[model samples]
Target: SLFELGKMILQETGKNPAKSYGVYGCNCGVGGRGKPKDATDRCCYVHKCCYKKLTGCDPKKDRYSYSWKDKTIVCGENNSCLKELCECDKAVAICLRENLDTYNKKYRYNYLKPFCKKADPC
Candidate 1:
């Protein structure tokens, strides 16, 4: 899903699909050491739900992430497909924006956190 895809990006370009741990947790990598530490983690929770109920996306597609939220016509540049795909991502973006709280002290500092860029989350 988006977690696995963004996890790879975290290693390469430092971008993530969710704020904390994408679908994993309010974490940066795969799993969460504990329960959600802050509202940031809630971002992933909301994201999973967004992906959970879809109308036009593929069953096996596992489309997650604030994909193409830039309104990049990455709408496949049209409504051909990936339309529902980007909708979930778009909701994820707003979820994080409303929930992100860095000073909650609920976040864990992992090796992935040090250099993790702020452009994206997961």
Candidate 2:
């Protein structure tokens, strides 16, 4: 799905994905009410599938210092494939855009505040 694939880029590069809030992972977790405990949750274990595959970063440790909202396309890296996979459900996409700036700012300050040359989120 678009969400998963895009998430992979964000997680992998540690760069802002043009959106924010880390990656949305899979909708497999959010339920009809948009809460946890849905069948989606079981299917959308992002820490296992999305993040690990993309960044090869350790969630248990690396997550504390990085913010997904700060990640961007790794320059010179082959992220062209991500463009084709960025689409998602229309409503989801809209929501992402509508709230992107907020998520970016929030996560940027919250998690990305501390930075290191080798510790770039992207």
Candidate 3:
């Protein structure tokens, strides 16, 4: 089944016999502060920082949220808060992919160590 395939994929995804994961003094995806492990994390870190400069935006919740409802929040551009929503999303997304690191270590799966956070409280 697809579920079993996904489960198997997850196991295979994190498997690295020779490589140890990163341990940066920073958190990338959600809350918690630190430095960038990769350009991907750097962009996300930048995204959080951008929010702190803006007003009327939930720096905490809106920054890392990929909720389906937030799709409009990205391009809707109805107000000031939403205005930077586009930029924040664009900045991070572009940086993650654009900031070049042309090596196998760039995203060898282990790079994801400092990038993802455990699920936030509901």
Candidate 4:
């Protein structure tokens, strides 16, 4: 199953080991107005970000959404490995393969971390 594989890849690269899974929503911060207020809000934010990145939308509107139907919300599945979607995968794979020690330590994986890069949320 792609979901299981995605979870495994996520765990192997350094995210939490999920026993079960749901959609990949934003884990970034929260706030009011133009920022995420909660989980659904955060999901919308992630979707909006990806949408704008792909389509060049302004995303400043009061309503922005990228539903599960869009087929682009699932990163690492169905060949959806865009830069933002697979940001961590690329960084981790590249850095680890190259033996970039500093990043390995920061991301807490020597090909063993949950994900790579200190700044990227994946």
* Predictions in order: lDDT: 0.44, 0.30, 0.42, 0.30
For the record, the alpha-carbon RMSD of candidate 4 to the native fold, in angstroms, is: 13.1
Q: Which sequence of candidate numbers ranks them by lDDT, best first?
A: 1, 3, 2, 4
lDDT of 3 by residue, 26-90 (tens): 33333444555555445546665765667776543453322224332234445677456545655
lDDT by residue (1-122, candidate 2, tens digit) is: 43443454445534454343332322222211112222222123321333333443332232121123444322222243222223212223334444433332322222222231221121
Where model 1 places Cα greater than 4 Å from the true spot, the runs are 1-36, 59-81, 97-100, 103-122
1-122 per-residue lDDT for model 4 (tens digits) = 22432443344334442311122212221211133223332333344344344433222221222222342223343233333434333322222223322222222212221232222232
CA RMSD of each candidate after superposition? 9.1, 14.1, 11.0, 13.1
Clashes of 3: 1
Q: Give the TM-score of candidate 3.
A: 0.46
Residue-pair clashes, model 1: 8
Rank ordering of all candidates by TM-score, starting from the highest: 3, 1, 2, 4
In terms of TM-score, which candidate is stronger, 2 or 4?
2
Cα error, residue 4 of model 4, in Å, equals 9.2
lDDT of 1 at 18: 41
Give each model a TM-score: 0.43, 0.23, 0.46, 0.22
Question: Local error of candidate 4 at 117, Å?
Answer: 34
Query: What is the lDDT for 121 in model 4?
Result: 34
Backbone clash count, each prediction separately: 8, 14, 1, 8
